[PDB]
Each structure stands twice: as C-alpha cells, then as structure tokens.
Ligand binder design. Structure first.
Ligand SMILES: CC(=O)c1csc(NC(=O)C2C[NH2+]C2)n1
Length: 130
C-alpha cells in the first residue's frame, strides 16, 4: 500500500541519517570504504562478507533494509569483521578493535534514543506479511 511505502521511505531517511553521522566521525574512517585489494590482498580471501558504511548507504538506496533489525545486522558485520581481521595484541590491531566496538556501540545508542519502538514493530509486521 501507499501507507506502507511511506513507512519504508521514512525508514530509509532515518537509516541514511544514522549512517551519515557514523561516517563523518573521524574514529570510523577505516570503516567508510571497502578495503583496497592493493594495500590488503588477503582481505577478500579472509573476510567472506565484507561490509562498510558506503556499502550500507548503497543498500539503503536499493531498498535492501525493511527493518532497523536488518540494518543493525550489517553494522554488527562491520564490527565482527574488524575483530576477526585484527585479533593481535599489537597496538594497531587493538586500536581498530576499539574503534569497531565504538562504531557498534554508537549505532546502537543512536537507535535506542531515536528509533520509535512502534515504528520498528510496524516495519517488522509489514516485512513479515511479504
Ligand atoms: C576494515 C578493517 O578491519 C581493516 C582495514 S585495515 C585493518 N587492519 C590492519 O591494517 C592491521 C595493521 N594494523 C592492523 N583492518
């Protein structure tokens, strides 16, 4: 219905706004673009499902997210990929892991404060009806 299309459009506006606020944070720069195969050749072979904030924006615009739950699965993937690729005790790895957890924590905190629970429930019920 038109009301349901309006609901998903509001969802996309909300998700673009959250994603933009993450992408402009200097801490999260490393998560804003896919990994360069030239600088890091073994990334594509180690990380089977790469994810980054530019790809998240692309997926929003392709209508790939029908709920905030599905969006947070990709935020979680950005973070979990970073922890898996940088597991060592060296400061370079520890810095990226700290930033990855901060990205995840920040996304969840924005959503906890700004996502209306009844709006998410409506999205989920439309999704389940398709
Ligand atoms: C996106 C992501 O997780 C990523 C990009 S580079 C990297 N890790 C390194 O470059 C290692 C050298 N210090 C750690 N991780």
């Amino acid at each position: 219905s038109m009301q349901e299309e309006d609901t998903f459009r509001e969802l996309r506006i909300f998700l673009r706004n959250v994603t933009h606020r993450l992408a402009i944070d200097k801490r999260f720069r490393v998560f804003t673009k896919p990994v360069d195969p030239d600088e890091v050749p073994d990334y594509v072979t180690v990380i089977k499902q790469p994810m980054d904030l530019s790809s998240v924006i692309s997926k929003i615009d392709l209508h790939k997210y029908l709920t905030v739950k599905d969006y947070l699965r990709d935020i979680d993937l950005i973070c979990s990929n970073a922890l898996e690729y940088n597991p060592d005790r060296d400061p370079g790895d520890r810095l990226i892991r700290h930033r990855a957890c901060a990205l995840r924590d920040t996304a969840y905190a924005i959503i906890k404060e700004e996502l209306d629970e009844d709006f998410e429930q409506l999205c989920e019920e439309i999704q389940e009806s398709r």
